[PDB]
Amino acid sequence: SPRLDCAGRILTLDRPRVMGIVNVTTHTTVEAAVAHGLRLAEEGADLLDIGGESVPVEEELRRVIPVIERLVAQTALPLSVDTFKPEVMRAAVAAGAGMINDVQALRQPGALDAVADLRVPVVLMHMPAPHYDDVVAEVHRFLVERIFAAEMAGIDKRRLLIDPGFGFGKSTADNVQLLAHLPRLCELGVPVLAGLSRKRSIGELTGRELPEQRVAGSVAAHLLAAQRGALLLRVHDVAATVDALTVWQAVQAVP
Amino acid sequence: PRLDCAGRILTLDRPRVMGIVNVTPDSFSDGGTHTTVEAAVAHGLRLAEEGADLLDIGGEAVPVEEELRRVIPVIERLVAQTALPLSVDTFKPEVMRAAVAAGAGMINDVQALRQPGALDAVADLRVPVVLMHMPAPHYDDVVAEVHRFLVERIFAAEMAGIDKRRLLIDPGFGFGKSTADNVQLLAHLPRLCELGVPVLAGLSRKRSIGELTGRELPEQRVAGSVAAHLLAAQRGALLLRVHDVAATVDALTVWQAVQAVP
Ligand SMILES: Nc1nc2ncc(CNc3ccc(C(=O)O)cc3)nc2c(=O)[nH]1
Ligand SMILES: Nc1nc2ncc(CNc3ccc(C(=O)O)cc3)nc2c(=O)[nH]1
């Protein structure tokens, strides 16, 4: 099973794990984000993903660093930094972040070299909605190219995670196709992370217009993603996703 | 399966949702300004708005006269205010007959027509019937024992003149079953689907869900129940008996979208 060394905090993917979303978009903003990350840790998150973007590096650092510093001291959970900027990647890891969550899959100038030096795990996400002749084949080809580019830069394959990037330049039909064909992405030999949390495609499938109305559909999408091979799930609704996976694990355990 | 619920058709081309409507004073926040009937009707209407495919009305040891007093006015009001099929959750043939006369289109029987007169009552009514298993006792093989019991009740119903096409079966999750027995039955649910009759599963906010997730209160068991019901549908169940209708509907809709991909 994949064993991820998140700067000393081990994340073991022997079973699907839960990555709690901590959005940090001022002391009162930092305070709210830290309290939320603590709530998600109590709800059974296996990892916290800290994001301060959607902006200049120094602004992104002002938001993310105090949250990383406080959460690394107050929780024993691995911490992920959601950024595509190499200067943020280096500074966040210096602050205590144990993983890089990169929507740009190390395509920003200097990201490859920055991460090669850090020895933390890295999520290689797909983001190009454009027309796809075959979204599954195109996402697979892109992810192969990024795995190889990371390996050529000196990043050990065992530090890699991949992600189809649900909702990034993808129609509802493209997202459903990627979820249904998720086992094809699991053949790249690297753990797959799926993030469908309260996303527009969940809302379109269920007719739920607002993010918080999409919890039931998101918990179901994440259970299906885990059934189809995903080993990490990026969610807002930690306790609910934990309960869904626990029930499924009990059923799956029956010989 | 196409179930004719006294004129209201329930098509089981996909897993369907049976909304739980409990007609008991205890089931509602007793402020003291609403009647029990009024609260149960409003709840059944809310579940219909949430996308329930059928409502299951239950009044229950409850004396038969009190059971009738609870379920009948609720059935009369819901049959007029919704187009959904209505199930009556009862083991008493007097309630079965009266509920069908009031507008109920299905009988949901925890006793699988074992009460004296239930076989006769159902044979005459020509409405679908749920045959549930209820004996927690020690089981040498809970799956084999539940399967045998259900075979015997299907046979008994057919021998009484009840057309096989009007039957549904149900493993009775939580009825004389440990958490381990319930998990075993859910995991081995495809074995029950081999009997050629639609399978109903009800794990809604049940103690076993609470034990699996560490959720002490019924209302904290929603996520675990929605997951159990999705797994039951993946494993062959065509009907799901739930409190959390909108949430179960959303889970099944996402799964249907994924399943539809060739
Ligand atoms: N690795 C990873 N990181 C992410 N970071 C932010 C986000 C947030 N992105 C959005 C994209 C689309 C939508 C949408 O509503 O479709 C909402 C948020 N997603 C992910 C993701 O899925 N994977
Ligand atoms: N067909 C059918 N009807 C039912 N009626 C009442 C109930 C309520 N039964 C309970 C049994 C156990 C528990 C529990 O918490 O274990 C709660 C309710 N369940 C069903 C069911 O599963 N199937």
Beta-carbon contacts of B117 under 8 Å, excluding residues fewer than 6 positions away, are B93, B94
Three-class SS state of B115: coil
Amino acid letter for position B201:
A
Rounded Cα distance between B160 and B97, Å, is: 16
Rounded Cα distance between B215 and B209, Å, is: 8
Q: Any idea of the CA torsion for B230, B234, B238, B239, to the nearest 10 degrees?
A: -20
Task: Output the six-digit token pair for B185.
Answer: 């039955």
Q: Residue A171: what are its φ and ψ, rounded to 5°?
A: -75, 170
Contact status of B217 with chain A (Cβ, < 8 Å): no
Burial class (CB in 10 A: 0-12, 13-18, 19+), B137: exposed
Amino acid letter for position B211:
E
CATH number of B1-262: 3.20.20.20
Rounded Cα distance between A226 and A229, Å, is: 5
Q: Smallest Cα–Cα separation from B194: which of B230, B140, B136, B146?
A: B146
Residues across chain B:
262
Q: Residue B90: what are its φ and ψ, rounded to 5°?
A: -155, 155
Residues across chain A:
255
Do residue A217 and residue B250 have CB atoms under 8 angstroms apart? yes
Helix, strand, coil share of chain A (percent; to 5): 50, 15, 35
Rounded Cα distance between A237 and B214, Å, is: 17
**Taking CB atoms and a 6 Å cutoff, what residues make up the pocket around ligand 1?**
A 82, 101, 103, 123, 125, 163, 165-168, 193, 195, 199-200, 234
Task: Output the six-digit token pair for A1.
Answer: 């099973």
Ligand lying closest to the C-alpha of residue B239? 2
Q: Smallest Cα–Cα separation from A102: which of A163, A158, A154, A56?
A: A163
* Paired strand residues for A100: A81, A122
Beta-carbon contacts of A107 under 8 Å, excluding residues fewer than 6 positions away, are A84, A146
Closest residue of chain B to A206, computed from CA coordinates: B250
User: What is the stated resolution of the deposited model, in angstroms?
Assistant: 2.0
The neighbour count for residue A151, using CB atoms within 10 Å, is 13
Q: Residue A209: what are its φ and ψ, rounded to 5°?
A: -75, -30
List active site positions of B.
Answer: 206, 241
Q: Any idea of the CA torsion for A244, B17, A205, A178, to the nearest 10 degrees?
A: 50
Rounded Cα distance between B145 and A178, Å, is: 41
Which of A247, A248, A249, A252 to probe the B interface (max B CBs under 10 A)? Answer: A247
For chain B, first and last CA: distance in Å? 23
Q: Is B221 in the pocket of ligand 2 (CB under 6 A)?
A: no
Amino acid letter for position B56:
D
Q: Smallest Cα–Cα separation from A246: which of A223, A230, A224?
A: A223
DSSP state of A107: -
Domain at A1-255: CATH architecture: Alpha-Beta Barrel (3.20)
Rounded Cα distance between A176 and A154, Å, is: 34
Amino acid letter for position B258:
V
Task: Output the six-digit token pair for B72.
Answer: 């009948």
Rounded Cα distance between A135 and B151, Å, is: 47
Q: Closest approach of chain B CAs to the CA of A220, in angstroms?
A: 5
Q: Smallest Cα–Cα separation from B169: which of B183, B155, B187, B184?
A: B155
Rounded Cα distance between A229 and A186, Å, is: 6
Cβ atoms of residues A7 and A1 within 8 Å? no
Rounded Cα distance between B170 and B46, Å, is: 25
